[PDB]
Amino acid sequence: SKFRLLENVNGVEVLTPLNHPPLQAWMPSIRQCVNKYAETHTGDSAPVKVIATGGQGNQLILNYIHTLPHSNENVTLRIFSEQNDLGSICK
Protein backbone atom coordinates (compact mmCIF):
# COMPACT_ATOMS: atom_id res chain seq x y z
CA SER A 1 0.00 0.00 0.00
CA LYS A 2 2.96 2.30 -0.69
CA PHE A 3 2.55 4.96 -3.37
CA ARG A 4 4.95 6.66 -5.76
CA LEU A 5 4.40 10.28 -6.81
CA LEU A 6 3.59 10.66 -10.50
CA GLU A 7 3.34 14.43 -10.19
CA ASN A 8 2.30 17.17 -7.83
CA VAL A 9 -0.43 19.00 -9.75
CA ASN A 10 -1.21 22.37 -8.12
CA GLY A 11 -0.83 21.01 -4.60
CA VAL A 12 -2.62 17.70 -5.30
CA GLU A 13 -0.34 14.67 -5.08
CA VAL A 14 -1.03 12.39 -8.04
CA LEU A 15 -0.03 8.98 -6.71
CA THR A 16 -0.03 5.41 -7.97
CA PRO A 17 0.88 2.16 -6.20
CA LEU A 18 4.65 1.62 -6.13
CA ASN A 19 4.74 -1.10 -8.75
CA HIS A 20 1.72 -0.10 -10.80
CA PRO A 21 2.47 -0.09 -14.56
CA PRO A 22 3.36 3.20 -16.26
CA LEU A 23 0.75 5.95 -16.49
CA GLN A 24 2.75 8.82 -18.06
CA ALA A 25 0.56 8.74 -21.19
CA TRP A 26 -2.47 9.70 -19.08
CA MET A 27 -0.88 12.79 -17.56
CA PRO A 28 -2.51 15.44 -19.80
CA SER A 29 -5.92 13.92 -19.02
CA ILE A 30 -5.12 13.63 -15.32
CA ARG A 31 -4.00 17.26 -15.21
CA GLN A 32 -7.21 18.42 -16.85
CA CYS A 33 -9.26 16.30 -14.45
CA VAL A 34 -7.47 17.75 -11.42
CA ASN A 35 -7.95 21.25 -12.88
CA LYS A 36 -11.70 20.74 -13.28
CA TYR A 37 -12.09 19.03 -9.91
CA ALA A 38 -10.47 22.02 -8.25
CA GLU A 39 -13.29 24.19 -9.64
CA THR A 40 -15.81 22.57 -7.27
CA HIS A 41 -13.35 21.77 -4.43
CA THR A 42 -11.40 24.75 -3.07
CA GLY A 43 -9.71 25.76 0.15
CA ASP A 44 -10.10 23.22 2.93
CA SER A 45 -12.13 21.10 0.49
CA ALA A 46 -9.28 20.79 -2.02
CA PRO A 47 -8.25 17.13 -2.35
CA VAL A 48 -4.96 16.14 -0.75
CA LYS A 49 -4.20 13.46 -3.31
CA VAL A 50 -5.57 11.55 -6.24
CA ILE A 51 -4.73 7.88 -6.69
CA ALA A 52 -4.49 6.85 -10.34
CA THR A 53 -4.83 3.17 -11.28
CA GLY A 54 -5.75 1.09 -14.30
CA GLY A 55 -5.12 2.86 -17.57
CA GLN A 56 -3.68 -0.12 -19.41
CA GLY A 57 -6.73 -0.17 -21.66
CA ASN A 58 -8.96 2.79 -22.40
CA GLN A 59 -10.15 3.42 -18.81
CA LEU A 60 -8.38 5.07 -15.87
CA ILE A 61 -9.58 5.16 -12.25
CA LEU A 62 -8.95 8.33 -10.23
CA ASN A 63 -9.65 8.30 -6.50
CA TYR A 64 -9.76 11.81 -5.02
CA ILE A 65 -8.94 11.81 -1.31
CA HIS A 66 -9.77 14.79 0.89
CA THR A 67 -8.80 15.73 4.41
CA LEU A 68 -10.71 13.68 6.97
CA PRO A 69 -13.19 16.50 7.84
CA HIS A 70 -14.02 16.63 4.12
CA SER A 71 -13.96 12.90 3.45
CA ASN A 72 -17.62 12.99 2.44
CA GLU A 73 -16.25 14.54 -0.77
CA ASN A 74 -13.99 11.58 -1.57
CA VAL A 75 -14.83 10.15 -4.98
CA THR A 76 -13.83 7.44 -7.39
CA LEU A 77 -14.05 8.68 -10.98
CA ARG A 78 -13.49 6.82 -14.24
CA ILE A 79 -12.15 8.52 -17.34
CA PHE A 80 -11.72 7.18 -20.86
CA SER A 81 -8.87 7.80 -23.26
CA GLU A 82 -10.99 8.63 -26.32
CA GLN A 83 -14.04 10.24 -24.70
CA ASN A 84 -13.84 13.94 -23.80
CA ASP A 85 -16.18 14.67 -20.88
CA LEU A 86 -13.53 15.66 -18.34
CA GLY A 87 -15.34 18.92 -17.61
CA SER A 88 -18.44 17.02 -16.48
CA ILE A 89 -16.84 13.83 -15.12
CA CYS A 90 -14.28 15.74 -13.03
CA LYS A 91 -16.76 18.49 -12.01
Author numbering: 200 to 290
Task: Give sentences copied directly from the paper behind this entry.
The dbToxRp from V. vulnificus, which shares 55.2% identity to the V. cholerae ToxR periplasmic domain, readily crystallized. The crystal structure of V. vulnificus intra-chain disulfide ToxR periplasmic domain (Vv-dbToxRp) was solved by molecular replacement using a selenomethionine (SeMet) labeled structure to 1.25 Å (Statistics are shown in Table S1). Given the two structures are essentially the same we focused on analyzing the native structure. The 5 β-strands are arranged in a β-sheet with one side packed against the two α-helices, through hydrophobic interactions. Interactions of note include a Pi-Pi stacking interaction between the Tyr236 from α1 and Tyr263 from β4 in the hydrophobic core of the protein. A sulfate ion was found in the structure, stabilized by the side chain of Arg203 and the amide nitrogens of Leu222 and Gln223. Finally, the disulfide bond between Cys232 and Cys289 covalently attaches α2 to α1 stabilizing the structure. Interestingly, the density of the α2-β5 loop (residues 281–284) was poorly defined. In addition, the α2-β5 loop has the highest B-factors in the structure. Taken together this indicates the loop is flexible. Therefore, we hypothesize a major role of the disulfide bond is to stabilize the structure, and importantly the ToxS binding region, by constraining this flexible loop as well as the relatively short helix, α2, which follows it. Interestingly, MatchMaker35 aligned the VtrA periplasmic domain to dbToxRp with the lowest all atom RMSD of 5.5 Å, suggesting despite the placement of VtrA in the DALI search the VtrA and ToxR periplasmic domains are structural homologs.
